[PDB]
Amino acid sequence: FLAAYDQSGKLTPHLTLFVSFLKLLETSKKRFNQLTKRHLDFYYQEILHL
Amino acid sequence: INLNPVRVDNHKSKILASRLENDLKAKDDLEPAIPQGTFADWGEYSSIQ
């Protein structure tokens, strides 16, 4: 479905908003998943002082 | 020249006693600091409505 309507111009408006919203959220996923690295770095550099 | 035993003993005592003072001071500073934060319900959410 998602492939078929990508850039077709053919979705009903209530789905058009819902899907556009879900696409905007991809930038939040990118930021959120960097927490594991920040956590590790903090422990080795600020807690253990290495 | 002639030396007096009491004067020598006093100098020797002072020189060595000052070493004890440092060994004692060394007993308190045994650890590094760790940064401390706060706490505030980071998940609080208000409706977009």
Please outline what is shown here.
The structure is cut from a larger assembly and holds chains A (50 residues) and B (49 residues). Chain A is built from three helices and no strands.
Give your account of this protein's structure.
The structure is cut from a larger assembly and holds chains A (50 residues) and B (49 residues). With 50 residues, chain A is mostly helical. Chain A contains three helices and no strands. With 49 residues, chain B is mainly α.
Question: Structural class of the helix and strand makeup of chain A?
Answer: mainly alpha
What is Rg of chain B?
Answer: 30 Å
Order of helices and strands of chain A: HHH
Percent helix of chain A, as a range, is: 55-70%
> How large is the share of residues in beta strands of chain A?
under 5%
Query: What is the N-to-C succession of helices and strands of chain B?
Result: H
Number of helices of chain B: 1
Proportion of helical residues of chain B = 40-55%
Using a beta-carbon cutoff below 8 angstroms, give the protein chain pair with the largest interface and the number of residues from each chain. Answer: A-B, 3 and 3 residues
Structural class by helix and strand composition of chain B: mainly alpha
Largest sheet of chain B at a glance? none
Q: How far do the termini of chain B sit from each other? A: 101 Å
How far apart the termini of chain A lie comes to 51 Å
Question: What is the count of β-strands of chain B?
Answer: 0
Oligomeric status of the shown chains? part of a larger assembly
> How many runs of DSSP E, i.e. beta strands of chain A?
0
Strand count, sense and barrel status of the largest sheet of chain A are:
none
Strand content of chain B: under 5%
Shape label of chain A: rod-shaped
Q: What secondary-structure arrangement, pairings included, does this model have?
A:
This is part of a larger assembly, with chains A (50 residues) and B (49 residues).
Chain A (H helix, E strand, L loop, with lengths): L12 H12 L1 H7 L2 H13 L3
Chain B lengths: L4 H21 L24
